[PDB]
Amino acid sequence: SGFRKMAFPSGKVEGCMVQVTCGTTTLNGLWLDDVVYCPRHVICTSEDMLNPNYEDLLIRKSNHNFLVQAGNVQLRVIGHSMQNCVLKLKVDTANPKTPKYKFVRIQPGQTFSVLACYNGSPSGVYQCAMRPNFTIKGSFLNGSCGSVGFNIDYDCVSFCYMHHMELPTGVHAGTDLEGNFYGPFVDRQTAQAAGTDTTITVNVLAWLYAAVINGDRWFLNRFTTTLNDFNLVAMKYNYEPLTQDHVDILGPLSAQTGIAVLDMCASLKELLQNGMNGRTILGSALLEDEFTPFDVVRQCSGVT
Amino acid sequence: SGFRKMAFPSGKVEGCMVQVTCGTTTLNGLWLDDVVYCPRHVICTSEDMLNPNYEDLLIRKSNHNFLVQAGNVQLRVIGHSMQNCVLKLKVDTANPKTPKYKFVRIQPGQTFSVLACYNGSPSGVYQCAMRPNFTIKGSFLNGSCGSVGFNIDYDCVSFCYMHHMELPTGVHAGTDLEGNFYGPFVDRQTAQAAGTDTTITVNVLAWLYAAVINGDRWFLNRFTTTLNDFNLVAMKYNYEPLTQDHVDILGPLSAQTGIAVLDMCASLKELLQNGMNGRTILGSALLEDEFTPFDVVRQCSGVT
Ligand SMILES: OC1CCN(Cc2ccsc2)CC1
Numbered sequence: 001s002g003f004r005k006m007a008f009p010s011g012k013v014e015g016c017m018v019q020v021t022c023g024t025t026t027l028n029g030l031w032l033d034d035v036v037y038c039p040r041h042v043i044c045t046s047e048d049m050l051n052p053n054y055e056d057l058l059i060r061k062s063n064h065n066f067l068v069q070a071g072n073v074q075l076r077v078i079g080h081s082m083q084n085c086v087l088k089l090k091v092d093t094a095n096p097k098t099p100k101y102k103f104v105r106i107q108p109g110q111t112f113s114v115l116a117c118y119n120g121s122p123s124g125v126y127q128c129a130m131r132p133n134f135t136i137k138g139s140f141l142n143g144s145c146g147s148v149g150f151n152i153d154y155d156c157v158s159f160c161y162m163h164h165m166e167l168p169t170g171v172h173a174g175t176d177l178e179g180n181f182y183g184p185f186v187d188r189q190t191a192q193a194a195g196t197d198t199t200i201t202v203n204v205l206a207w208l209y210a211a212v213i214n215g216d217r218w219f220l221n222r223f224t225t226t227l228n229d230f231n232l233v234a235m236k237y238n239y240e241p242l243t244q245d246h247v248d249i250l251g252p253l254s255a256q257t258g259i260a261v262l263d264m265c266a267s268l269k270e271l272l273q274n275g276m277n278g279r280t281i282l283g284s285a286l287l288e289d290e291f292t293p294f295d296v297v298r299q300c301s302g303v304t
Numbered sequence: 305s306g307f308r309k310m311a312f313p314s315g316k317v318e319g320c321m322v323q324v325t326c327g328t329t330t331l332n333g334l335w336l337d338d339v340v341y342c343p344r345h346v347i348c349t350s351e352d353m354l355n356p357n358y359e360d361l362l363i364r365k366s367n368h369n370f371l372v373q374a375g376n377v378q379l380r381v382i383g384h385s386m387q388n389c390v391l392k393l394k395v396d397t398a399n400p401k402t403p404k405y406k407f408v409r410i411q412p413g414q415t416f417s418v419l420a421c422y423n424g425s426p427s428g429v430y431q432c433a434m435r436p437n438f439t440i441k442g443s444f445l446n447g448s449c450g451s452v453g454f455n456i457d458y459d460c461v462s463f464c465y466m467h468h469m470e471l472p473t474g475v476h477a478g479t480d481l482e483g484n485f486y487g488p489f490v491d492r493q494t495a496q497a498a499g500t501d502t503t504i505t506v507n508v509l510a511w512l513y514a515a516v517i518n519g520d521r522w523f524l525n526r527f528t529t530t531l532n533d534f535n536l537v538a539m540k541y542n543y544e545p546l547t548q549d550h551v552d553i554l555g556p557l558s559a560q561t562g563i564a565v566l567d568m569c570a571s572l573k574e575l576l577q578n579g580m581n582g583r584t585i586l587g588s589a590l591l592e593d594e595f596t597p598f599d600v601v602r603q604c605s606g607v608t
């Protein structure tokens with residue numbers, strides 16, 4: 001019993017983190033097989049980041065300008081290319097700790113673990129969600145760029161996020177491992193405002209189910225609702241619309257608890273309308289939206 | 305910027321987790337050098353756990369009854385002893401992945417990371433605090449016993465917790481790695497009630513400082529207080545007394561923010577007396593007490 005914001009074990013990713021230095025900039029890279037992936041803004045001086053022309057800046061760079069260190073051992077760079085907003089540094093040595101891996105581009109509302117790193121060294125691990133506005137609310141200081149977000153399926157690491165920047169509001173933006181930003185953000189030191197940070201409704205419901213499984217039941221009410229009625233309330237509270245795809249995904253939690261998805265919607269409706277009246281659910285005073293239905297099943301079933 | 309409930313990178317501990325089987329019971333053990341540490345209740349049948357006599361149960365056990373598997377490779381048990389509530393299984397092979405480590409007995413209010421494991425396989429990592437009543441609020445299903453709590457200081461893992469049981473209230477109890485329970489709990493299937501779960505005041509203050517550093521400042525007020533006055537309020541709200549030792553430990557956070565510890569106490573006083581009026585601090589609607597002053601400095605400074 002008990003329910004925690006739980007990150008994937010980080011060891012498989014720890015074995016992939018290296019330091020990349022270009023001129024006076026040091027950040028993190030991800031060493032998989034004989035390629036090191038890092039943010040392309042590693043090549044940029046302060047003045048460059050006003051309006052950086054990455055193709056033009058890279059013309060001035062050679063293989064030997066990219067200093068790649070794995071622990072205290074230097075890797076030999078034998079090639080480099082830009083793919084969208086990431087650099088791929090070909091090194092002469094395959095990472096011997098390379099896990100089975102995939103590169104995945106996640107959808108908003110999907111959760112993943114971040115291994116926060118500085119100088120290619122891990123400092124900690126936490127669980128994130130891709131916000132509906134394609135920001136993440138991370139914990140990143142200078143030097144943390146190139147830190148990655150991932151999911152693990154038994155022995156296969158799915159890399160979904162590489163950290164590139166903090167917005168002036170202190171929320172975080174980055175790319176998939178093909179170098180494509182989540183959301184409309186660009187790797188430039190310019191005013192970039194995030195859109196509405198809405199609540200991930202399907203995740204809230206999953207977490208309400210987690211609460212019931214763990215014996216927190218005070219919020220279960222006598223009511224039901226419809227998808228359309230619930231959605232009227234959801235929009236009023238800056239909650240994402242709930243679709244039948246979301247209802248389908250909640251089916252196993254519905255089955256285990258015997259609480260119909262639309263009944264749980266009516267419980268969530270009353271919580272939105274009434275607030276929590278100073279009560280807590282799984283030790284939270286707000287409705288938690290950074291657990292997916294898959295996260296709840298996994299944690300509640302004990303998948304390794 | 306940003307502030308997250310952050311676990312230590314778990315790789316060094318992942319490399320220590322093995323499966324221990326005695327008869328039909330499988331749980332986790334910790335393989336350090338040529339010793340595997342596990343909960344002694346591995347030897348117990350259902351009927352044993354009413355009033356188990358561990359010395360008498362162990363007389364019926366031999367080395368070859370303890371099945372120890374590290375990944376898919378069996379370890380040869382060449383000796384076994386009981387130390388308090390843990391078994392130490394001497395194996396013929398030193399764990400080649402043994403990190404620099406210490407065994408530490410932590411104080412209530414200290415935080416640590418748990419690597420939740422099943423069949424010697426890691427499922428996830430989260431950050432805990434030892435509650436003032438010497439319980440932890442974990443996420444543990446059947447098979448998770450022998451999962452460990454730890455801190456990391458650069459390359460040295462300090463092991464502080466081994467998981468042994470869930471109380472009928474769904475909170476967790478366990479031992480240090482010398483096998484001594486935190487709190488008054490025993491490894492027996494009997495009514496055991498936890499004492500008052502008070503709030504770790506010094507941690508709340510550390511987290512208020514973290515909030516200020518991250519730009520969440522709405523709760524800072526025009527007031528100050530005294531240790532005695534604050535403590536009167538603290539006792540009324542089931543907060544741990546604050547001592548000058550706690551004030552001393554908050555000194556670096558006081559210094560960085562320029563907010564005197566007793567002023568932050570007066571902010572916390574008003575939050576206790578007034579509540580949060582539907583506002584949040586670092587995305588929490590309650591006062592977070594599972595960050596130590598050391599945790600706040602570490603996360604806010606980027607220690608690897
Ligand atoms: O000058 C270098 C260090 C600081 N970074 C900041 C940044 C701004 C947009 S994306 C990354 C840029 C490169």
Ligand SMILES: OC1CCN(Cc2ccsc2)CC1
Pocket residue numbers: 329345346348349350353468469490491492493
């Ligand atoms: O029968 C075995 C499996 C279940 N455990 C439960 C337990 C009760 C007190 S401590 C651990 C005991 C041994």
